[PDB]
Amino acid sequence: GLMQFTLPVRLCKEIELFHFDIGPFENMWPGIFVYMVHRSCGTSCFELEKLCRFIMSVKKNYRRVPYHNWKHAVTVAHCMYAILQNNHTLFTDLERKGLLIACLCHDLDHRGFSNSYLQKFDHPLAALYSTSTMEQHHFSQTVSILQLEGHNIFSTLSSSEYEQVLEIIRKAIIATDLALYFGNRKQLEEMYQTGSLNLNNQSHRDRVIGLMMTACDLCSVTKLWPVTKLTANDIYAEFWAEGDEMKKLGIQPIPMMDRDKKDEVPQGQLGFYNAVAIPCYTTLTQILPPTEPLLKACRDNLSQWEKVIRGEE
Numbered sequence: 001g002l003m004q005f006t007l008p009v010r011l012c013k014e015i016e017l018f019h020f021d022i023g024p025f026e027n028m029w030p031g032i033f034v035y036m037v038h039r040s041c042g043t044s045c046f047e048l049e050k051l052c053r054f055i056m057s058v059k060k061n062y063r064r065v066p067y068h069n070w071k072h073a074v075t076v077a078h079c080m081y082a083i084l085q086n087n088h089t090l091f092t093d094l095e096r097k098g099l100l101i102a103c104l105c106h107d108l109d110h111r112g113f114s115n116s117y118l119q120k121f122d123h124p125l126a127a128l129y130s131t132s133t134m135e136q137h138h139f140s141q142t143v144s145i146l147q148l149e150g151h152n153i154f155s156t157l158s159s160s161e162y163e164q165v166l167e168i169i170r171k172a173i174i175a176t177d178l179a180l181y182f183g184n185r186k187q188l189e190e191m192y193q194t195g196s197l198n199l200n201n202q203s204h205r206d207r208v209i210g211l212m213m214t215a216c217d218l219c220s221v222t223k224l225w226p227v228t229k230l231t232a233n234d235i236y237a238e239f240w241a242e243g244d245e246m247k248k249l250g251i252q253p254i255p256m257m258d259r260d261k262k263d264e265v266p267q268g269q270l271g272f273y274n275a276v277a278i279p280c281y282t283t284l285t286q287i288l289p290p291t292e293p294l295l296k297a298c299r300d301n302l303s304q305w306e307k308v309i310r311g312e313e
């Protein structure tokens, strides 16, 4: 009832900042997430015994892959927490509630392979879900954990609030499909610039929550350089394993996934910052001005990749 979660001082302060790293102590990550729900949503959003049981089933359903693991789930939710705390009054009670959960769940049961590798391997999930294959699976796994006994953290919501919150979570998780990001950002750019962007238009809110989801999902490019650079090793560890598997199916993988083309990593990061990360955080900053630190941190890391190329590290 009167049972606040507290963090040591350095964490209590740094968790409010966009560039926070949740640290290497896995056993503190659930405490961090509950702390964020309590401050973002209130101590009354969720029955604590249910939330804790839900967090631990979510954790169990993430796998020990190098990048798309439980640490990423909690990192992406912390970024969403920072956006919600710096844009307090722009979001409904239900949006606050759905989005942190969506972020914790957005990569449930990921195997460390792209939608592309599933389709070329001809994985059962690719016939059940022809587009956003893994992302429809992540949502399906979320609804499964919600229907386990003692796990329905949304039990107190009305029939119709429950359905809105599962619909916010479904669109939030689908939007983490980066193939959908490009179109969704282009539309958001045009609506903002011609002045048509309207946050009372539910289809516009959808778009805006989708862009936040892409921003939170890519938030490793907004950390301090030593965090960003070591995360790149985890990311390439998956991409190269998928490369290996492509070659096993008789297919030349794209260079990004070819461990034989390691040399050209720095130049490939530039591509990614310019083609994906910078545009994402630019459009997000225009629509939500208090998210600017994400843009500035991204630009700092692009500039660190330029330095890697010029032999200066």
Ligand SMILES: Cn1cc(-c2ccccc2)nc1C#Cc1ccc2nc(C3CC3)c(CO)n2n1
Binding pocket: 217, 218, 219, 220, 221, 231, 232, 235, 255, 256, 257, 261, 262, 263, 264, 265, 267, 268, 269, 271, 272
């Ligand atoms: C487009 N491309 C081409 C090549 C390439 C070409 C030739 C030889 C070697 C590599 N590499 C890339 C790349 C990338 C990439 C993709 C997703 C992603 N998410 C994140 C953080 C949010 C987690 C990072 C940053 O690490 N990334 N980075």
Ligand SMILES: [Mg+2]
Binding pocket: 106, 107, 134, 176, 177
């Ligand atoms: Mg994903």
Ligand SMILES: [Zn+2]
Binding pocket: 072, 076, 106, 107, 176, 217
């Ligand atoms: Zn993700």
